[PDB]
Structure formats: C-alpha cells, structure tokens
Design a protein around this ligand. Structure first.
Ligand SMILES: CCCCC(=O)CC(=O)O
Ligand SMILES: CCCCC(=O)CC(=O)O
Lengths: 258, 257
C-alpha cells in the first residue's frame, strides 16, 4: 500500500460535486484526493461573464498546482473538456504529475491542436435538444455562453446514470463561456520536452455513440498516449454511471505508475 | 385516498442549496408529482456571494419571487428544512392562500407569539463555535462576525453522521458560508400573525437522532396541526432517510388536501 494524491478536473457545466462518488471511495480507502471547481463552476464565486479568458477558467487548477508542496507528486485526472485544463497543467508543472489520466478527455497535441478538438467537441453539444446560448457580446456576434438543458442532460449525458444524479446535475450545472478558438490555441501550448515528458493514460469510456468513439480514437491516433484503458457501460459521466469501475481503474493506474 | 397531482416546493437550510434534495426530487418526479427545489441567496448555484446580501430579505428573495410568479389558482406543499423554516414562515405570511400545507422538517418554527429572535439565538448556539466551525470578520473587530463557515468535521459528526459517506463528500464540495444575519433584521423580516401565517396548515416532522429538547419546545409555544416522526434520521433527513421522507411527504400531502 502507498498513499496517493488524486486530483480531479471536471468537464463543461460541472464542478467538484460530480466526483462525489469517487471522492468518497478514495477517502475511505486512505488516499488523498482534491476535487477542484474551475472558473464559474460548482461553488466557484466567479460568474461566467466575468471569465471571458480561458486562463481565468483554468485558474483554480493552475493556482492549486502552483501551491503544491515540494517532494509531492499527484495523479491528475481530467474528464472530457477537463482534458484541456490538465494538458496546460502538464506543460507548466511536469515535475509535479506522476501520471495524467484522460477520462474520455479532450487530449490535444502537436499533430492535433486544441482548436481542432474543441470545434468538434462543441458540435455534438451546440444546438442539441434544449441547450441554449446567450448573446451579451451582441446579437450579431458569436454566442457568449452555453447552458445545458435538462433534456439534453437526461438523454445525451446521464442516459445511463441513476435518476437521482440527473436530478443532482439539474440543480448544479452552470453556464459555460464560449471561449474563442484563437484564445484557446494561444493558451494551450504544448512542447515535447515538458507536456511530452509526463506519463499519460487514456480511458475510453463511451457507449451507444459511434461518432464520439471515433473522435476519441482519432485523438489517441494523432497524439499517442503511454497506455489506453477502457471502461464499458459508461455514459458521458463515468463518475456517475460506472464509479466503482472508475475508482478501480484509477487505483490501478496510480499503483503501477508510481 | 385518490392520487391527485401536487406541486412540492422544497426549501433548504444553512450552508446548503437545492442540491441537498436530489434524492427527494428524483423520487417525486418518478411518482408523477411536481417538485421545485430552490437555492436561497448565496446558496448552491445562486449568483450572490454571502457578503453581498447582509439583509435577510435578500436571502429569502428567491423563494418570495417564486411564490409571487406562481399562477393564479395553484396551491403548493411547502417544505422548510431547519433554517428553511424561517423562509417558509415568511412565505406563509405573505402568500397564505398559495400554500395548501406547510411542512417543517426539523425546521425553525416561530409563531405570532414565540419571536424569531429567540429561535435564532438557540439555533446559533448549537452551530456557532461547534467543532471546526469558524467565523470571519470582514467588517473588522469592532463589529459582529460577518459569515459562518461549516467545517468538514462538524458536517461529519453533527449533520451527516447517519448518511451514506458519498453524501458527506457531496456536501464538503458544495456547502457555502452563511451571512450571520442580525436578530434585529430577522425579527423585522419575519413578522408572523394568527390571521395569515396562522391560517395555513402546519405539520412538523421530528428527526429523532438529529436538539431533541429544543425541537420539542417549539411545538409547545407554536402548536402545529400535527407532529410526525422519522426514526434514525440525522440532521439531513433527505440524505439519511430519503424514502421515509418521500412517503411521509406523500402521506402529508393527502391528509391536508
Ligand atoms: C465546448 C463544449 C464542451 C464539450 C464536451 O466535452 C461536452 C461535455 O463534456 O459535456
Ligand atoms: C444560525 C443558523 C443555525 C440554523 C441551523 O440549524 C443550520 C443547520 O441546519 O445546521
């Protein structure tokens, strides 16, 4: 047995809260675990309109990374959009991350940039069902914020999770600022000396979506990680739908990658 | 007793937010009822930060607004948890016609007679200075402490002690500070009378293992139309005894149709 430090980064609309099942599992197993709210997510005091810059969004993670004690390594886990966050963290603090885990996460690299993975990720999300956008940047300008609808969540995201967790999400999802492609590319810059030097595992966790799986496959091909693992039966929120499996997978990764 | 579709309105306590009711919400939406769970000021995903709302009417406003916008002839079952007892009390005075039955789940239940002054001072003593709860002095040492912050140990020992462990984790990630409202503010915001507040039906739900003597005391000074019990509940009944709460709420809905 070795005590580990897991660090959990959520996706669009979400927060630290979505990890509650895993947090509990990690804690009562005697491991250390931090689950962070990004900008204007969960109980982060910023509203979405106050963080138009991607660095503002990534800020809770960056400052936490900068705050980590000397001889300490972590297991950095990023879910879906959470992948961009943990990528930037790897480039900036490679000497603090024992291994980075991309749970069906956006995983850009030199051969497939952040601009690419984001336009594609946002295609499945924008316009789907009862989702909606705001126009505080002007009614003739590109949409400002994106808001997850209850029906979108139920049918596209939590479609394989318990009904209480849908309810939980419904009372907690917060709007996401629609960061400009240019801003995201300027922000998430990756080298092979740094980001490339961090051990990296991808977790394919999707079901009943061939197009999404292809996107995850394409990302693994253009930016090959050290390992690829898999969790079957998962909807778009694995920490809700397949939590025991995910915790096992995360403990397994942690122990062998020391 | 035939099933009639009803609308439940759920109101949380200090540090919490609509999220705490997640299990109740799912169970009602499954049964064919309407349910709305609300964030009060600077609770859950409400935009206001606690320091931005030193007046009680601002803590209460999301409920008061919801109540006002309710269509003409619709009545509701209104559930106040603990601190949420004051909010539903205020709502009972302003909009008595709109509430078929008010339900006080271990709630602060002052009457026209026992002032909201006394009730808060008692509620404060068991929270303030308890274990790892800490206060903050944003307006300096000259003035009263500004916010109250619930500590993870206080949560583990006095609030969540009988709840599944994952619910404790959920809470550590979501609890928010609460502005320490002055009892002079609450006194003047919560003005209760026997004509209005008194006209609304009231049920109190005791949580056995929640103070067992203070909750007992409020019933003497302000008698509800009934008392009910849920055994083995901690301070968050909706977390520890959700099904018992859910069925009790159904049962309650019916007797006071
Ligand atoms: C930019 C839109 C976010 C893309 C996603 O990855 C959707 C999700 O995680 O729910
Ligand atoms: C002064 C606020 C105390 C009210 C409470 O009793 C809050 C709780 O449920 O722990």
């Amino acid at each position: 047995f070795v005590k580990k430090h897991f660090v959990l980064v959520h996706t669009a609309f979400h927060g630290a809260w979505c990890w509650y099942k895993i947090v509990a599992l990690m804690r009562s197993s005697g491991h250390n675990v931090t689950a962070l709210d990004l900008g204007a997510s969960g109980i982060n005091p910023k509203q979405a309109l106050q963080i138009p810059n991607f660095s503002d969004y990534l800020s809770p993670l960056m400052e936490f990374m900068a705050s980590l004690p000397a001889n300490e390594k972590i297991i950095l886990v990023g879910h879906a959009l959470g992948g961009l966050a943990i990528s930037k963290a790897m480039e900036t603090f490679p000497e603090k991350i024992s291994v980075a885990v991309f749970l069906s996460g956006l995983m850009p690299g030199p051969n497939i940039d952040a601009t690419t993975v984001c336009t594609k990720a946002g295609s499945a999300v924008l316009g789907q069902l009862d989702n909606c956008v705001t126009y505080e940047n002007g009614p003739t300008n590109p949409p400002t914020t994106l808001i997850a609808g209850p029906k979108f969540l139920a049918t596209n995201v939590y479609h394989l999770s318990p009904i209480e967790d849908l309810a939980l999400a419904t009372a907690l999802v917060r709007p996401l600022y629609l960061y400009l492609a240019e801003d995201i590319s300027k922000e998430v810059v990756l080298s092979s000396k740094r980001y490339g030097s961090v051990k990296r595992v991808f977790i394919v966790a999707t079901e009943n979506d061939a197009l999404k799986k292809e996107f995850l496959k394409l990302m693994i091909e253009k930016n090959p990680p050290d390992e690829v693992k898999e969790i079957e039966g998962s909807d778009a929120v694995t920490m809700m739908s397949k939590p025991q499996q995910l915790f096992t997978t995360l403990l397994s990764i942690a122990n062998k990658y020391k």
